[PDB]
Nucleic acid binder design. Structure first.
Ligand SMILES: [Mg+2]
Ligand SMILES: [Zn+2]
Ligand SMILES: [Zn+2]
Ligand SMILES: [Zn+2]
Ligand SMILES: [Zn+2]
Length: 1218
RNA sequence: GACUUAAUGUCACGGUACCCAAUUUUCUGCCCCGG
């Protein structure tokens, strides 16, 4: 007599390839998956087949359930008693069973009236098949008193349709690294989770118990069960290959990788980012467009090629098309550039009479308190049919919902239970006996569920670099990315303990994982916990219990709520099933001893807030390539799930990444102990390797995101700051070298508050805790700016708040003779002159590394004030209509003064480039920026005519010039960081009555500098660095301010906010690992003399920007305030370095230093007021004084003066040109 | 039926795809003579 019987899975069950019992021992995977669902191949080719569950496995589960049920009812079921059965086949009697039981079999007291034999037997002996005609060798199906047929899948079927190959893990508790790994085929329970078979039972005497047993089997094939009675990829890989080939024709293979990431980010922007062409077009200055999306692939641009690819691949979705194209591009870029599976003994266990076995069900929501990462292999390597990387995908199910797998949740629960108990074993994989440590005994009663989320938007991608310790730049080829689900994402957490009493340790773990009003949830599920990926908070926790000793038939009838825990969590006490009563004495964490002693002090919280008084640019490089806008650098923002809104929040939260926070702390620790300078970290017991982990041991500190909590306070949170690179010989810039960053608008009196936190392991040393707070103090002092452009002055830490739950230079330059002998100022000088430095540039291959704070070298901070001697123009070029007067005059660019959050600033890029020009001129160093590609009108280019040692330092194989050594190189971070100059005291603006904005002041037209005047013929070379005189031609501009607005066209001049002379700024120069002479030369580059000033900003040939830097304080840590005498010692030892390069310090003895200081001499600092201005173009030109003969026709003609005397008059500072 | 089990004995829910890695380095939004 047969019954048909269907078993339904409710989580992804495990599938293995079917092998027969003799050939099953050859493969370790099938030895592992004896208890799994088997998969055989219907035809040849190893691509299609049939899945089934063996009847021996279902019979093993039913017999285990029968043992548990008869132990719960003390050997009886519905009146008829059962004996203890048999589980000991003698080898002398016959062949052993194919599966030998290793567990502790539950054996009760046998109270049957008669012994069990062929004529009469108990339901235990009958369901076991003790006394039937069937045996170890199967002949016919009619010899079975009880028969379990194979359970065939109820739905040719291919393996890739049903299963996904997944690598599991075995993480060591002491080290945190996986000891080994193994593979399963996690099969789709939603489509192929129903398996139908037949059970043939002959006599009815063991019938009802069997219908009990089908209601009591909770596990088959690695999943929860209810058992009831009754090609685009090939063509896209080809097109990605031809895209990689077209990029390799341009030698842009290294961009292909980030292109893959860019395409893998395009799934977050929908179809319209390609259909409506919202890809960035690149800067309009460069005629070639975008550096990535306008690359010609087979004659057409990459944006239109991607349009054609999407139009050819509209059959698959946009997410699948972008994921497959980015995966193919990453795989082609990767191509072009341990595994462990697995004396019989019968162990009877008799529980005491009167004991109460119960089943606790703990249901809750597993909210992601942090962005989470559950690791999976690449889908090219995770093919179930066919069986180092740098791009890592998060784990998803068949419909791209995020999942917490049962294995990862179970391993994290095992780790936390090993923490809660004092002791714990490492899980042996082939023990014939059960492990007797407390963690294994408690987790043998614990069952969980594979959680999946109701949210399926694509993961954010976290991009990560390793900084080179020596150069403090990105290590080449070390960029790698992972995929994160958002924080706030909730997962249905299911736990089920099957035991006599609920353990104190597991309740301590559940209170440890749960979040409260003053407690953080602490379920570290997933990967990269060191970067704080996957800290989950348990919430909405409800525990109920089935009292299985007396209320067992309605545990069987409801099947333990094994498919409706989602129903169980929402619904309340009134609709609860019979036998399932809520759990009242779940003990709180205030009196749970293994929580308070072992779990609560295990990870100590240090939460703090970083006040950043600078703009903050943690660059999202891929997001600059996918989001619309022409910004090369935008701040990092991340997607955060809102559980209340059940969606991603519409505003992304700006944050400094937890990996950036972790790396900042890691270099802060490793620099103070010198552990960053180690060439390798393998089996290292260094302080940085103990605290932050290595490739063999996990980190004992965990870092979360520095989330910006101040972002609602700023009116415009993202400030636009556009920088440009200034040529050294032409005073203008290069349009192709312009780059605009988009940092967060941070500033001194309106700082960015960044809420970050890190967790410390229990057992930190007295030393290592002091290293951690010393790293925190180093960040607090401002040693480590956050994000990019730290040398430019971005992301500077003004301070750190810890939560309660945790001089003048006395040198006077003589100047030039002609302005001092001209009291009436009838001489007219050129607005710029060229520093006549030779071709000798000293280069050092002994490059000072950034990996440690060297004792003999000097590191500190210079507090400098900045006094404007003439009015200063630092334009805010983000708004080309910052003064709002383009409506009256179209095309007339008008800028405000540079300001972040209303308060007035000078960027440290301007100060840094100015001091870089002064230091490069001071040290006779290389022309670090030059227009190589420009031609004159001629046989050679501009860069060809420049000297070879005057060329910019490219790479660190050759030496670096002192300007390139101090301020940096593309391959080497600079050792000086120039802060943004805040404004304190002065007259603020230069008010002029003729202007409609009295703050503003229009200047003359600023045309491009002409090297044809400076280099007249082919024989003349580059004369030198162009510097501008310190004069008061701004007074001349102010006098003819009425005439300027009509004599020239509006689209040729600019009207800008102008800060008056006498204004005081304050800026910090944080210097790092400088020599004794380098600090002195830098301090001399700040304050060169009594009558020496500096020129920065717009209007330098017009007299604007004459600024005086004087130093209040030099602070040096090894923290102390350096006195005046040691400052003079540093400056004097820099002076001796200048003499040994040339071969009270008197600077004018050095000829090029004398010429540079004469260029930067201030004649009006006295009664001198020289009028210097450019000559007019012709005799009939505007602003020409008649009889002066100061037209450009006179100086341009070689008959009036020779070419060489014009070059000599351009190289002589303050030489009279009239 | 068979693909596809063996039946007096399947802890495989017996195993966290773990572990390490600062998307940053460099760059004054600058400016005068020809056609
Ligand atoms: Mg039998
Ligand atoms: Zn019996
Ligand atoms: Zn154990
Ligand atoms: Zn180390
Ligand atoms: Zn250089």
């Amino acid at each position: 007599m047969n019954i048909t019987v269907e078993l339904t899975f409710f989580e992804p069950y495990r599938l293995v390839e079917w092998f027969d019992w003799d050939a099953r021992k050859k493969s370790h995977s099938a030895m592992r998956g004896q208890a799994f669902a088997q998969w055989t191949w219907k035809g040849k080719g190893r691509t299609a087949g049939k899945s089934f569950i063996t009847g021996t496995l279902v019979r093993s589960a039913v017999i285990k359930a029968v043992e548990e049920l008869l132990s719960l009812n003390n050997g009886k079921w519905e009146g008829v008693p059962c004996c203890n059965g048999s589980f000991q086949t003698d080898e002398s009697k016959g062949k052993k069973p194919s599966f030998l039981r290793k567990r502790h079999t539950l054996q009760w007291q046998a109270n049957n009236k008669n012994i069990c034999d062929k004529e009469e037997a108990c339901p235990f002996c009958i369901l076991l098949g003790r006394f039937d005609n069937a045996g170890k060798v199967h002949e016919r199906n009619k010899d079975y008193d009880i028969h379990f047929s194979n359970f065939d899948l109820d739905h040719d079927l291919r393996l890739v349709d049903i299963a996904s190959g997944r690598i599991l893990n075995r993480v060591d508790f002491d080290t945190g690294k996986a000891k080994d790994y193994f593979r399963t085929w996690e099969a789709d329970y939603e489509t192929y989770g129903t398996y139908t078979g037949r059970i043939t039972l002959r006599n009815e005497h063991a019938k009802k118990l069997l219908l009990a047993s089908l209601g009591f089997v909770d596990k088959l094939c690695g999943a929860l069960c209810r058992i009831e009675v009754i090609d685009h990829n090939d063509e896209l890989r080809k097109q990605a290959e031809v895209i990689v080939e077209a990029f390799k024709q341009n030698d842009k293979l290294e961009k292909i990788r980030i292109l893959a990431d860019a395409i893998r980010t395009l799934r977050l922007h929908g179809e319209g980012v390609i259909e409506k062409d919202e890809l960035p077009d690149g800067k309009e200055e460069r005629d070639k467009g975008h550096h990535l999306w306008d690359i010609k692939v087979q004659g057409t641009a990459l944006r239109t090629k991607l349009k054609e690819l999407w139009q050819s691949n509209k059959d698959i979705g946009w997410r699948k098309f972008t994921e497959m194209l980015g995966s193919n591009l990453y795989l082609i870029y990767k191509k072009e550039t341990t595994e462990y599976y697995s004396s019989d003994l019968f162990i009877p266990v008799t529980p005491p009479e009167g004991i109460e076995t119960k089943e606790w069900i703990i249901v809750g929501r597993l909210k992601a308190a942090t962005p989470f990462y559950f690791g999976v292999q690449q889908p090219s390597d995770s093919i179930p049919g066919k069986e180092e990387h740098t791009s890592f995908n998060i784990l998803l199910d068949k419909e791209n919902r995020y999942r917490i797998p049962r294995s990862a949740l179970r391993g994290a629960l095992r780790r936390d239970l090993r923490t809660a108990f004092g002791s714990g074993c490492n899980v042996s994989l082939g023990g014939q006996i059960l492990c007797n440590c407390k963690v294994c005994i408690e987790m043998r009663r614990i069952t969980l569920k594979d959680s999946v989320s109701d949210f399926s938007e694509p993961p954010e991608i976290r991009y990560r670099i390793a900084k080179n310790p020596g150069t403090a730049t990105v290590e080449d080829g070390s960029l790698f990315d992972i995929e994160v689900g958002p924080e706030g994402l909730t997962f249905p957490f299911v736990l089920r303990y099957r035991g006599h009493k609920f353990p104190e340790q597991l309740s301590s773990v559940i209170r440890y994982w749960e979040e409260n009003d003053g407690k953080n949830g602490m379920a570290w599920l997933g990967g990269l916990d060191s970067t704080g990926k996957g800290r989950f908070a348990l919430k909405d926790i409800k525990i109920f219990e089935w009292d299985l000793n007396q209320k067992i038939n309605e545990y069987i009838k409801e099947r333990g709520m094994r498919g409706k825990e989602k129903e169980l969590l929402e619904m309340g006490e009134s609709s609860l099933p019979d036998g399932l009563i809520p759990y009242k004495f779940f003990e709180e964490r205030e009196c749970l001893f293994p929580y308070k002693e072992n779990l609560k002090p295990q990870w100590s919280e240090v939460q703090y807030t970083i006040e950043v008084g600078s703009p903050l640019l943690t660059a999202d490089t891929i997001s600059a390539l996918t989001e619309p806008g022409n910004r090369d650098a935008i701040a990092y923002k991340k997607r955060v799930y809102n559980d209340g809104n059940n969606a991603i929040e519409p505003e992304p939260r700006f944050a400094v990444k937890s990996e950036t926070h972790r790396g900042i702390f890691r270099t802060a620790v490793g620099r103070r102990t010198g552990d960053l300078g180690k060439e390798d970290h393998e089996d290292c017991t260094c302080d940085m390797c103990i605290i932050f982990g290595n490739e063999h041991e996990s980190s004992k500190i965990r870092f979360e995101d520095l989330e910006l909590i101040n972002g609602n306070e700023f009116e415009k949170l993202e400030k636009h700051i556009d920088h440009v690179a200034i040529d050294r010989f032409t005073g203008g810039a290069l349009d192709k070298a312009k780059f605009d960053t988009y940092p967060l608008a941070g500033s001194p009196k309106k700082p960015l508050k960044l809420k970050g936190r890190f967790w410390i392991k229990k057992g930190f040393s007295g030393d290592h805790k002091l290293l951690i707070t010393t790293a925190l103090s180093d960040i607090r002092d401002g040693l480590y700016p956050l994000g990019s452009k730290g040398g430019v002055g971005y992301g500077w830490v003004a301070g750190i708040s810890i939560d309660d739950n945790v001089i003048n230079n006395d040198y006077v330059h003589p100047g030039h003779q002609s302005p001092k002998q001209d009291h009436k100022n009838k001489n007219i000088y050129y607005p710029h002159y060229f520093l006549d430095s030779g071709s000798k540039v000293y280069r050092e291959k002994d490059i000072i590394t950034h990996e440690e704070f060297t004792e003999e070298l000097l590191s500190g901070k210079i507090n400098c004030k900045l006094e404007t001697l003439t009015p200063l123009i630092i334009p805010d070029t983000s708004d080309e209509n910052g003064l709002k007067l383009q409506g009256n005059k179209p095309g007339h660019k008008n800028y405000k003064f540079f300001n972040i959050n209303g308060e007035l600033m000078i960027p440290g890029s301007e100060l840094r480039g100015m001091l870089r020009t002064h230091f490069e001129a001071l040290t006779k160093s290389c022309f670090a920026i030059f227009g190589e590609d420009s031609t004159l009108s001629a046989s050679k280019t501009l860069g060809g005519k420049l000297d070879k040692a005057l060329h910019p330092c490219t790479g660190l194989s050759d030496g670096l010039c002192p300007g390139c050594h101090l301020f940096g190189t593309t391959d080497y971070k600079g050792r000086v960081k120039f802060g943004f100059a805040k404004y304190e005291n002065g007259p603020e603006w230069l008010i002029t009555r003729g202007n409609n904005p009295e703050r503003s002041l229009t200047l003359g037209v600023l045309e491009s500098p002409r090297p044809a005047f400076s280099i007249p013929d082919d024989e003349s070379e580059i004369p030198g660095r162009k510097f501008y005189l310190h004069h008061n031609g701004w007074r001349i501009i102010r006098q003819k301010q009425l005439e300027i607005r009509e004599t020239v066209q509006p689209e040729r001049n600019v009207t800008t906010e102008v800060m008056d002379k006498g204004n005081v700024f304050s800026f910090d120069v944080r210097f790092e690992n400088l020599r004794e002479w380098e600090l002195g030369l830098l301090l001399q580059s700040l304050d060169p003399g009594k009558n020496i000033a500096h020129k920065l900003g717009k209007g330098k040939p017009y007299g604007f920007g004459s600024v005086k830097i004087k130093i209040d304080s030099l602070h040096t840590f090894k923290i102390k305030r350096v006195p005046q005498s040691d400052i003079r010692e540093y400056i004097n030892k820099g002076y001796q370095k200048l003499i040994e390069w040339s071969g009270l310090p008197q600077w004018h003895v050095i000829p090029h230093i004398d010429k540079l200081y004469k260029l930067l001499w201030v004649p009006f600092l006295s009664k001198l007021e020289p009028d210097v201005r450019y000559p007019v173009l012709n005799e009939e030109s505007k602003g020409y004084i008649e009889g002066s003969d100061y037209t450009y026709k006179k100086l341009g003609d070689k008959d009036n003066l020779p070419y060489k005397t014009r070059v000599k008059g351009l190289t002589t500072p303050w030489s009279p040109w009239n």
